[PDB]
Amino acid sequence: VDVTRDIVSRERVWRTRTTILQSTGKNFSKNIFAILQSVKARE
């Protein structure tokens, strides 16, 4: 109905699900994938 688009337009979402999982700092995964490959070097 008009109420649905009427509300979901005017509000805002600053807090979702997905960026909870993502960290507020910058933690890249190269270090993570480097040790991922390093344990594979033990394999």
Partner: peptide, 25 residues
């Protein structure tokens, strides 16, 4: 003593639920 205390040791992992921040017009 002879052996340690028994446990079902697991490296579990929890999940946050949906936040539902109060909305911003």
């Amino acid at each position: 003593e002879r052996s340690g205390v028994v446990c079902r040791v697991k490296y579990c992992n929890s999940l946050p639920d949906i936040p539902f921040d109060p909305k911003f017009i």
